Design a protein. Structure first.
Length: 331
């Protein structure tokens, strides 16, 4: 029969009304600079294979971050560069400063503005209830902007959120998985990190949209207010949905599958079972209760929905009572 089609309920046609060159990144011509304008100072990497470095612009002695790109198709290099140029100057979007190639190895690298980041595994333990509301609101500014610009981030997670806590500066980074939204397009479901994958990716529903980012944001919020990182801790993609189903219940999951006529992998038949939708009070205890409030639970519940159409938009999220005090202080 086939799956039922889907369209984003906001910013549906913003790319159609753009000139072709805005979203047709395969035709984008890159102007490569010389990496000899920057001297690498220290590896900021997280693994053996990442190539992120702190560097100095020798011309003006300003601190920057150099990301040496892994060998992927030239299309994906142009896609990330075009998206970074399209979003330049947006709220809490990382600023692309330069694009260079190593003269010897001809390896392409992206140069970004420097952020004095504190890693989330050390920062989140210290965040007050107000800090979480403040930083969630800052992420929502970046998400509403890039969604309004016809772009899905598709890899929202704490590792991709740089925070200068001293200056309360937040930047959304790592746009190498980001894509342009086009109504009716079927996208690859092998995106985002496992613990932040939306149900549509896990059940192989390809006609998704910006609301994928809002599920990932819901996973971040749940880990922060409940002090459980990550919140849905699956062992693989199949077990990831099982972890979700033990919290949100299987009834809404099978309703979601029936509504879009999604063909469920036969492996999910045995492992999913039957589970009720749990109340969020079950995850509250004396170590996290100071971060949990009725406003936080109401907001979180509206992000973590199987049906991507029923999740809050970034704009709707920014108007939730959970952020009333943050909006007041900003004005
Ligand atoms: N844009 C891709 C993200 C790459 N990346 C990895 N770790 C990073 C750190 Br730490 C800082 Br600070 C900055 Br700025 C960037 Br950019 C980082």
């Amino acid at each position: 029969s086939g799956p039922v089609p889907s369209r984003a309920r906001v910013y549906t046609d913003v790319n159609t009304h753009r000139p072709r060159e805005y979203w047709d990144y395969e035709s984008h011509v890159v102007e490569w600079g010389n990496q000899d304008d920057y001297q690498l100072v220290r590896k900021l990497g997280r693994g053996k294979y990442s190539e992120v470095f702190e560097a100095i612009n020798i011309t003006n002695n300003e601190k920057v971050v150099v990301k040496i790109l892994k060998p992927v198709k030239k299309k994906k290099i142009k896609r990330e560069i075009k998206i970074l140029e399209n979003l330049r100057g947006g709220p809490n979007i990382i600023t692309l400063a330069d694009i260079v190639k190593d003269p010897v190895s001809r390896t392409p690298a992206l140069v970004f503005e420097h952020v004095n980041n504190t890693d989330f595994k050390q920062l989140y333990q210290t965040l007050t209830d107000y800090d979480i509301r403040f930083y969630m609101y800052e992420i929502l500014k970046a998400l509403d902007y890039c969604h309004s610009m016809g772009i899905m981030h598709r890899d929202v997670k704490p590792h991709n959120v740089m925070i200068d806590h001293e200056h309360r500066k937040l930047r959304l980074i790592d746009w190498g998985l980001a894509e342009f939204y086009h109504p009716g397009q079927e996208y690859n479901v092998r995106v985002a990190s496992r613990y932040f994958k939306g149900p549509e990716l896990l059940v192989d529903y390809q006609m998704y949209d910006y609301s994928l980012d809002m599920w990932s944001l819901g996973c971040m919020l749940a880990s922060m207010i409940f002090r459980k990182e990550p919140f849905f801790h699956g062992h693989d993609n199949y077990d990831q949905l099982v972890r979700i189903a033990k919290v949100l219940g299987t009834e809404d999951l099978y309703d979601y599958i029936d509504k879009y006529n999604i063909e469920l992998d036969p492996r999910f038949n045995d492992i999913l079972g039957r589970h009720s939708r749990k109340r969020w009070e079950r995850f509250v205890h004396s170590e996290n209760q100071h971060l949990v409030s009725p406003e936080a639970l109401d907001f979180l519940d509206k992000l973590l929905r199987y049906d991507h159409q029923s999740r809050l938009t970034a704009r709707e999220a920014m108007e939730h009572p959970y952020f009333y005090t943050v909006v007041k202080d900003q004005a």
